[model samples]
Target: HMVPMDKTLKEFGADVQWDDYAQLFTLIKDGAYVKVKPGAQTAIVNGQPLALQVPVVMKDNKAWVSDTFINDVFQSGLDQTFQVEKRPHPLNALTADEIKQAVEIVKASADFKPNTRFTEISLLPPDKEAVWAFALENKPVDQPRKADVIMLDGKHIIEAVVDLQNNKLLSWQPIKDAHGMVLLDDFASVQNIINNSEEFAAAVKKRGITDAKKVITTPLTVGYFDGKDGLKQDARLLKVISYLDVGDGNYWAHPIENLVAVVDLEQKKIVKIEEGPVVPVPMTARPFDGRDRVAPAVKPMQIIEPEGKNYTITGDMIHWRNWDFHLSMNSRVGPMISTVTYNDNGTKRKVMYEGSLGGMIVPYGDPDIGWYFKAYLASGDYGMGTLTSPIARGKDAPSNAVLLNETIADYTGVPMEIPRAIAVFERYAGPEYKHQEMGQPNVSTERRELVVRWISTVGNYDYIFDWIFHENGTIGIDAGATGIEAVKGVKAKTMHDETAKDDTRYGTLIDHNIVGTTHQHIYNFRLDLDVDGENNSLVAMDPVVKPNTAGGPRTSTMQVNQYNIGNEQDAAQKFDPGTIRLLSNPNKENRMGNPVSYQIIPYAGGTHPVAKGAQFAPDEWIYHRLSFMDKQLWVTRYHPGERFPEGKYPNRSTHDTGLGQYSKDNESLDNTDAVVWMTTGTTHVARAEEWPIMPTEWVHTLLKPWNFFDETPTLGALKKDK
Candidate 1:
């Protein structure tokens, strides 16, 4: 007589995940969590133990619950929609018809060519969610899901859009001179080279690689030099790094070092295969040594449970305390928060239009041909969203965190699911405020944070990004890097060896014949501020020493000086530790008649470093390549087309076509729609401790409310009861 636990729970709208290996079941809904293990008499609900009337029993490999499940577990009212084949847009995931619509539209168009290769086909998500509500109500909207298609043909790159249901071309534009990412076929073309080319096979065999079929080749992007810019976007070249599939499935540990194959993408042939001095493979023969190492045992069952999550997610919209925002997944970038608003008093006030990772560069320092030109743009190049690594319960994220699955289109325009793509949870961020007064009762409350987290594994490095929302109207963007560090093989094991004296120029030796290099991971976050409405200005306040001219005083005193940045170019500058930057709305005022605003801080403290600008020389090729990484802060008028700091096409790019070009107009920023682009990073000098695998290194960026609210925003927050 009892309904299935999953069936009934899902009917009332719950996101449930089952761990097959652990034989555990988890269900999260409206901030409430329930965890039960098979045959367990007690179920954990909101952290308290509850004696179940009937135990969870496994029958025919499926779990079952008693008839009292619904009444005992939850009170039903809120409607829930079951998710399937998740898509980037909340509107819906791209379907096969939509993809074919784009392909058919391209083939029929006047611009069609014989050998066109589709690079990207995605849902052109609606600019605003206005039409979304009606569609959600089961009513038809004027607009339907459409596709954004990108193609590469000969020397020309094209961008297009097509209507799905109608299968009609909406618009098409010829992309002038920038390169798209390496296509799936391009990867296949190089695969063909290894399979068919005798020269390539011999090259692999020469490196003691026998199984050419098991070779996984990765593209090291070739950037444009002084004269290379003259070539068209399709004049692409790839320097490939091969990893041997040693059957143990630990290829990253067995690197075929210093051997690279230069391939002309168009010809699908080997331009050349060459190797430098052979550095013996790190011998990843055994499956990850960390698995074999003995771990010291400490407290085992430390559980974090929220009495209840204050945040509620409806579709992609999240509501927590005074904050409300919509989250969208991007194939290039990962999760993006949009239409952010805060409840000021009783009225909803606009805060930000959108915020996310625009682009980033990981540059190495070795200067050798193999190491030079090694700047990697993770999101734009390898597709961070595509490379999202699923979160393991209690390992990557806390057990209480709710896991969200995302659907994204691959290079072949097929939809793929990224399970456990993101995790959302409420965390204790210490005390919000505390003070002790004699003979008076202490008044204080706990600080709570709602966090949105996503992690991506790009090659040997794992990057974890967290967007933290606090009850104080403050938001934090935190980044952490961990995983097996990309290392160099050398004869020197210690700094005293002869090879150490010569090879220590760029890095430090961590293990025998292994050196960790000095490099930097620069990240640029683009935040579109609509503080108290769209019109805003960037105001810089600097602390300066002023001579004490007021009567009898010691010497000079420090006071903060206010400077208003009038134009885009003027707003682009390095972070001054003594300076306070605020994107203020001049038209809107708080109760005190002060401009409502949000303060910007490019650098904040983290595990490894606070934050720094690009450490490269000003004249380095990268300066000409990217303009956003140098300046710690930049403000520009809002242009939807200018979403990316490094431009839509960054691969093999020569000129500064992105942030540099956007700031060139020097347009007014005061009392207008504006955006703040912040740059933060670390100057990594690898030490010996990071060798076999590196622990997580973290960096942070922050935005705080400045006169944007009438009073303490979280005064109305439901306080946590101990």
Candidate 2:
């Protein structure tokens, strides 16, 4: 019997590699390897010679191998195994079968409409209390698994909830005058629309570009200008911006400046075209990929562990040291951490119920016709998780990191698989603590961190988010921004030219005919902290100078004042560096009678300028529609519907319906189930070094234990055996 090498080996999940110089084929899967040569009676199996019952042969651009090749050459690993599950965890992402079933239920309903498109189909998270109970105590909750669907049907936005376990549609409501998220189909439709438009072709021709096929266009949301930008209030539209593909790997380097196309997505045509003086597109071949470079001489350093991994993953839950959490990928938010807890002397205490990115905005600060409406809500306008870039080992992540695949429903309600969407690893992070008692033996402890990283690419920029956990009961959330800068095309060749004065006003002149624009990348995270339980309070500690009462020689002394932020409106305030903010559980106290709390540090440090506000005037339309970007912290009551900071449908929103509206009712937050939203950001000032392709600039936020324990949490590691 013979087996086809191309099909059979692929079906066997082997990585096939052809060595042209040696005239051999190598197959690899897990720890097994088999190398064979055509017209040979023997082969190499894990570096050992083996006799083949039949020789391998090549014909018709395909290879044929003996049927016994796998059994004779492939080595089975000692730790291979499989798992069976009886019930899905509440926080687990909906499976492919579940997604298909949810869509089928909606389609079979009596309220189903023709040509309905899906923008989101994700899990409707179970009750928070039930999830926490199950996570901490392994107590089962009798709840039905449900899916939430956001769909658009001919200018109508519909929200539906489907019960996956029951195979029924629970609720259906049509939202009025709201625009849903931009779909993947719209990206293709706008590109096709501009490519087929004669007017757009003429506009490109006027810019000295003849090939319309090489013209790439991006679908941008038209921000609400209140009829000043010549757009209707109820029109479903997108602004189209084009760039010339000058045969370079980076098309973003060549911008077709000042030419704008208003695409009416509902009508599927170019409704209007705004043309300005065309600046020549930069034709320089600046390939960001190292295409023409000599390989550097270096030895390979492998990352492995002789001992087994310290952490074990059971389904979506991960356990390492004292930290336990459930992680899953969402269609809107990328990586979500749920049911976070810490073990204290064998008692499982809840720290947080759920945490993830609420939303992010990338707002450019130029007032040009093409740049004025450039504030992009990356997560709400375009699904950031849907744009997740697969992580590569030894490059995007460390070699020892375990990459995980994620699945979510696409715009058409079909399951889409993202390979290597998340990476988990452990890293050594400096010393946890050190002390020397003069002549006594010094005591120091090594620190390790469990990192869960995810990356998403939105248009010209890639954002990397990491959730880091330390054994000392500290959690850090890090954001790294990298990728090519969105440069504007200009007439000035250098800064010494006369046109350079005006061209360099809004941005920096990096390359000839290219101006890197200034922008801000703002992010907000939602932390449903249960500190030690479900009820928590927001407390602020400020240090003030006071006159000394009983002291002599000293004029004044520093006194600390602590107060409770009683309501939602009072908690939404900018971060004052002098004050310390904490979310504390009043019911739980340490041995010293201090409230168990976690300090919220939104701005630890960053390379770029801190974005204190959106940099826009109070009357600006963006400020009217967004409020989370202006404040650093917000404490609101937990409501499942209030998940996104920029609102659910911010594609072309006209007013604020998110954090600003969520905190308007002035709900009391004293010893209540409160959720904290911390906003952190960096204003990217364009520099010459960050032009062609920018290096990653990072911003960090930390959640540290504040009087949560009596002493150092990691001191147990230093205790010698009695």
Candidate 3:
């Protein structure tokens, strides 16, 4: 049956109008069969010759063909034949002039250099004699050879060496253990390492320091391409602020590492490094200076009593400089505050504050990029307490309040003036639900409550300082904008779909359907002054343990431990979720539970070592543990309603309706107070987009407080100053 023509063809650039084409087709099908015709092409289909008519018209410096002729000739199937006049060249193909325009695009982008160096190296297993022989002879391996080794470094296989000889030994190693061998596949890898090592050795030799066994401590500074100031941004000046493990593979799941490589500018060589423990990248776009800068001989300031109202600390509230503030206190990361204000554009803004309180940097490298002060600040665009408009004090006060100077000094030894700064107040309400089961009639409910918090961001060397105040007599400081994490999707939909189909057996999926989902967040925090900030010696809480039951031995236990950024090398260890014992939580509700208390003692140990420059180095693993110990939070699930009892609601969501209500419940009341604390972060596997310097971003770490806060800090009555 002949189908009716629609206007869609016209939208697709068909030349003939609908009416004209219909008439032409009817005439050809009913008219006498013609042997020859002008402006036509012929083809054979189903053993019959078919003809197509064409009309050449010049428009926009190109020839346009009439669809009417072609449609009429081919309407009766490939039974008839015809011919069209020959043209000089097929104008349908892009002409030479058009090709030139396309080439110009390439030329215009010629100056755009991808920051990544690409190279491929062949990896042969030691057991593969033939492959070893081939390598010695510089011969290529057979094409049909299967991979003999496979090691999971997070979601990627660090080495997939194929056995060219016997295809027997699949001897794969994580990048951490094979530090000296990382990047060996690329010719540039070996060349870069050798060159860097030789340069370093030569510099030391020139200084007449030949004590290889002696522990030498030298300060080095690295700079990054400061995209903000257009300054020659040194890579060393950059710091990894946060990381995360959003993948599904367990053996491949590892913590995020904050890495900074120090290069000796004088000798153009690497000298020192620093790395955080295993954890994921923070999911916040912090200011550049939010990293925890550590050194020796750092003293803490005494919380001296402010005489005669320099600052007023009333019940769970702080009144200073005409601003009211409150805080959110917990055991894990400590006290945190969120400031509320309106921007000039009439938008509500909430900025959370937490981190190293009043920290300093001691320059160890070139003065230009050397020891400089840094801080972090984040302006959230989403969520409950967003800054919607410019705020005014006194006139807008909600009764009961205190007062202090609007202009004040910051902890980082810097002064500041805020014209439209926000004032926070405290309130507490009854518990509200957070999550509920889907397709279940059980009226299970979780609750949530709101709290008032206050924070201040004072500009310093390269970033800003965030001082936070909580209603629960808690005060802490935090850094902002250290670094960012960018993500891309890997694996196809078929694999993901299959996994989802089988997710019921493995329990509800955590980060499924979010395959390539990418987002940026602001990790404004509250440094629990008593936890991570006191004396720079903060205790990381240990996780509560629970029984494990998935094959293997019965009565196995799981729990989460500490959290911090780690080096790239450490991230290479392919430890599955089952192997990550430190992330297991006893109760699912209190995912941020800190069962163990641990702290960072300043000068207790030396600097955390790392590789230098934007490139991952082979020698970075030496003398560097690539790990740190810090308080952490986790999300662990056990056999629900067993010896390890599950709370009313386990899973958490941000949606405001139905199931989303559970998150609110957990936030308000300590219902699911059985979970443990585990750390998460990003693994360094360079994709096409994140080749050179990563864009401004952050990773996220979440630890849900179980029984830390007895009551909802945000729903209580505000203390009114008479």
Candidate 4:
């Protein structure tokens, strides 16, 4: 007996799509993807390969499979997925059904208000201590599952917590004087207002642009200036900055320079228009996608492990050789890694309880009318994760990567699926160690890294974020900035022009009539590290050169001094390259009698200029509103409320409500659970190479084991050759 290859799979409720180039048939159903080739006994099922009972045979331009194909491929459980018969792990992202339940619970409550839109509907993580207890000691979870919700009823911010187990509202609190994040609806609202505005149309007509559809407007967060910038108090507003599409693939190439329109979202109208000297939009058809030219094709490459992967993923929890961690996607933070532990010979040791992107600020230095308020908090103000760009299989990530899709709640409280939101793969990284003897063969072992990659697209920029785990117990968080440059139109086309110097004052002339503005991409990551245990302290080691006290005839010798940063304020200091800072567990010691610790390296090998701080005056409004950018590293006592470096609600914020407030209490850091905030970034000085589109510029940070282990952890990989 035989089954038709095309019709049989569709009858089983699978979406069938045949690839002529690869000569393979693909069937997707309920998250399971199965791909089969003619006359092959093996099938690729969801990135992993599996054996088939019978291969499909092609004859007379048609394909047919054995009758056992459905049972072998679909019912064999080759996808490695299981039914959720029990309660989910506390750290798992909310399921689609879970999101619906949480939203329904909130809507049905008496405290619910009409016309309120959801900005956040995410898992309210359990208590830190309780979660650690469950992770470390194998204790049963006792806390009820809860969801954190934030909604905007016009300009009012309302916060709510719902208990999913009992289906009841736990709290309904109204926040005061704080602005909510810019919502998805807010972007459309601003764009619609711009298109319908006769006032803005008239302003554009003055600049020789007649078609409003050719104009692309960006809703920018208007930073607070104590109402000096003409933004009304307690009103939801965004400054709309626009560009000319000009029938090109890259609209960013043609910026309508020196024009700003303020749109009041609540009023749904243009409240203000600030215009300057008209500069014609750069009319060049520079397609950043390289559509005008054909490029050479490279040879095929593949990263394969024939035997299988060294890691096993059961639910969200992943167990690699010596590492164990859980991964989840947050609406604001993108990727959150939780309950990180290192497996020793037999015991499991805690490394980090949780870690995620705290927040980031992209501030341009230009003080022109259109550029003055250009400081952007991408993650906090705009919810960068929601703007997640679906990663291409072989382009954004390696072809061997396993893509993971995520479902997040949109502004309408509907579950929205982000395809390929995260990718997980392993790559060989040169060598771990190599030894050469006089007469012996060379001995070396390959280094492997498991990278968790996530990308987010904010306006003209696409950020590639990776959380890398090495076999030797080193973790690296790499942030790569790519995509189109936010450019400006200028009268000068080249440096040889008469108006070059003045036109390129705040930026560099990279193209004809275009200036790639100087800006900074500042990033901060919140790392909740529990070195060996929950009680950790910030320990700084400074190498000093002093006179040898016990040596003979030695005038000066180098030694080291260790100091414990006793409090939050003391720990919040600038990073001196000469000094080594570690979150050390004083209670745990290595074989050499040193505290088990991990070194924090914020500026490892950044190619771009380090944004030691924002390129603004100390008295500037941004400095007063954000504090994490100036300092390279900060250690604060753990507070669940303190999640972001920028305040939770940074949209149109006036003051620093995040790290500045988190460390204001000056809590003692003496043997307590703490969070480390590592701030690192690049001051983007534009070049011609980065003008039309920028390649990925990476900034790397690392958490390395100092004396946490007794000896080298990868000694097991070394072997004698025959």
TM-score of each: 0.85, 0.90, 0.23, 0.92
Please list all clashing residue pairs in model 4, or write none if there are none.
Answer: none
Lowest summed lDDT window (length 10), candidate 3: 644-653
Query: Tens digit of lDDT per residue, candidate 2, span 505-545?
Result: 88899999999888899999998888999899999999899
State the weakest 10-residue window (summed lDDT) of model 1.
76-85
Model 1, span 1-722: residue lDDT tens: 54577777777556567889988887776445678887998877766676777887878877778888756765422212212223333444355556666787878988678787666677676654343333223234467677888877754678888877677888888877767776656777776776787877877677677677877777778776664323334567777777677766556656676777778887777777667876666554534555666878877452344355556667677778888777878778888887777776556777777888888878888865566667778887777887899987566876567778887767655667788899887878889987878899997889988889999977778899999988888989998898776666566767788878766787777666666777888888999878877788889888899988776856888888998999999999999766799999999888899888898998886666443677678887777878888888999998867877777788888788889998999999978889899888787887766756677888888899998887877667456763
Task: Point out where model 3 deviates above 4 Å.
Answer: 1-415, 419-698, 702-722
Q: Between prediction 1 and prediction 4, which has the larger lDDT?
A: 4
Better of 1 and 2 by lDDT: 2
Instruction: Report every candidate's CA lDDT.
Output: 0.75, 0.86, 0.25, 0.86
Model 2 misplacement above 4 A: 1-87, 717-722
- Between candidates 3 and 4, the one scoring higher on TM-score is 4
Error of 4 at 182 (Å): 1.1
Instruction: Encode model 3's per-residue lDDT on 65-172: one tens digit a residue.
Output: 455633544344442212222321110112223323322332233232232111111122122223222322334444433222222222122333333334233343
Q: Lowest summed lDDT over 10 consecutive residues: which window, candidate 2?
A: 76-85
Write one digit per residue (lDDT tens) for candidate 4, span 1-722. 79787788767645566777998887655335678888898998767787877788988868898998877876666555433325456788888888999889889988788889888899997988888777778776788889998888888999999998899899999999878888888878888999999989998989978787788889899898987797776888899899998876888998888999998888999999999999998998999776887997998674544333566667788788889998888888898999999988778999999999999989998888889999778888878778888887767987556677878888878899999899888889999988988799999999999999999998899898999999999999999999999988999988999999998898989999999889999999999999999999999999999887887898999899988999999988778767899999999999999999999988786878887766778898888889888888999998888998888988877788889889989999999998999999789989999868887899999999999998988897435663
Quote the lDDT for 75 in model 3.
49
